[PDB]
Amino acid sequence: NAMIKQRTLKNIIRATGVGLHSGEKVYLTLKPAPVDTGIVFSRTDLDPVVEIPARAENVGETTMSTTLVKGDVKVDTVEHLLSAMAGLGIDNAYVELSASEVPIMDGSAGPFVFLIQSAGLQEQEAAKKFIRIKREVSVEEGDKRAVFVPFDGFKVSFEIDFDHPVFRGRTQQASVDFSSTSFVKEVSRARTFGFMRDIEYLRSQNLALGGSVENAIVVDENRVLNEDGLRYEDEFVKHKILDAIGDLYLLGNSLIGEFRGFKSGHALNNQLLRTLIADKDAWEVVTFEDARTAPISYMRP
């Protein structure tokens, strides 16, 4: 039988861009890593070089993006790159950065999934480990909720709630079941977004210095300002799904289960992970010695 194997990169990937929040120019380098390394961020601009494993315990700030911290060393906005890594089944990789923030690229996981697939994937000689949800686990705060439900595969449901003319109809909720729907085709191209009133407040405080219509959907009181429009009819809720997939990948292993989110953000997503990790009776580590019988499928490398 053919086991589901761990994956890394076949070749080194190089990217350049700007941090959404910092506005700083950053050089990103993706490198192959040995079996059981996981995703590890590396700040190569520092002396000595500081390594931060992409794990729930290393999550610092969770206000507008997911930030990893080790001492006072930070790696900001890891969620879109981790979403791309999770979507393509990359287990092990070194993510080298020349600055404290992952480049925003076009605001989606699209440019990352393209850079990874261009370099190609390398299957490694070790079984891929999955975390299977055995019991329900939920976290709430006010009207926000995030839940893990046992499910034979991988499924993400998300609902947003904006009282705004652009956000009416069935476009405010989406469910993606990865047994029948491609992360690449239906999720990866969904861009980050911001409302003009919030952006004006951020700018007044010298925040979100790298943001523009080139790396985000900008919505005022009545419309989308981007001249070229949306990539999906429900691009906003698909971006929240992209975010949830990246934040969930801080578990350090692919999930076998279902995520449901209602107005959930980076903070509640990480509180859900921390609650699941603490509740050892709600999950177990599984491997698939026969890919045929597996409830999750990855694209060929």
Ligand X SMILES: C[C@@H](O)[C@H](NC(=O)c1ccc(-c2ccc(Br)cc2)cc1)C(=O)NO
The helix (run of H) or strand (run of E) holding residue 116 is helix 110-119
38 binds, among Zn ion, ligand X, none (CB under 5 to 8 A by kind): none
Q: Is 77 in the site for Zn ion (CB under 5 A)?
A: no
Q: For residues 275 and 137, is the Cβ–Cβ distance under 8 A?
A: yes
Q: Is 211 in the site for ligand X (CB under 6 A)?
A: yes
Which residues, numbered 222-241, are part of the site for ligand X (CB under 6 A)? Answer: 239
Size of the site for ligand X (CB under 6 A): 16
Stretch that binds ligand X, among 34-42, 177-185, 207-215, 253-261 (CB under 6 A): 207-215
Largest CA distance in the chain: 60
d(CA 157, CA 172): 11
Q: How does DSSP classify residue 224?
A: B
Residue 239 labelled as part of a binding site: yes
Give the residue with the Cβ less far from ligand X, 6 or 108.
Answer: 108
Which residues, numbered 237-276, are part of the site for Zn ion (CB under 5 A)? Answer: 243
Stretch that binds ligand X, among 36-44, 47-55, 115-123, 194-202 (CB under 6 A): 194-202
Beta carbon of residue 192, minimum distance to Zn ion (angstroms, whole number): 4
Query: After what residue numbers is the chain broken, C–N > 2.5 angstroms?
Result: none
Stretch that binds ligand X, among 44-52, 54-62, 175-183, 205-213 (CB under 6 A): 205-213
Amino acid code (one letter) for 165:
P
Burial class (CB within 10 angstroms; exposed 0-12, middle 13-18, buried 19+) of 205:
exposed
Q: Is 208 in the site for ligand X (CB under 6 A)?
A: yes
Q: Catalytic pick from 65, 266, 288, 294?
A: 266
**Cα 35 from chain centre:** 21
Quick check: is 266 catalytic? yes
Beta carbon of residue 280, minimum distance to ligand X (angstroms, whole number): 29
Residue 80 labelled as part of a binding site: yes
Beta carbon of residue 211, minimum distance to ligand X (angstroms, whole number): 3
3 state SS of 141: strand
**What contacts 79, CB < 8 A, 6 or more positions away?**
65, 66, 242, 243, 246, 247, 266
d(CA 301, CA 292): 17
Which residues, numbered 102-161, are part of the site for ligand X (CB under 6 A)? Answer: none
As annotated, the active-site residues are 266
Which residues of this chain interact with ligand X, rule CB under 6 A? Answer: 64-65, 79, 192-194, 199, 202, 208, 211-212, 216, 218, 239, 243, 265
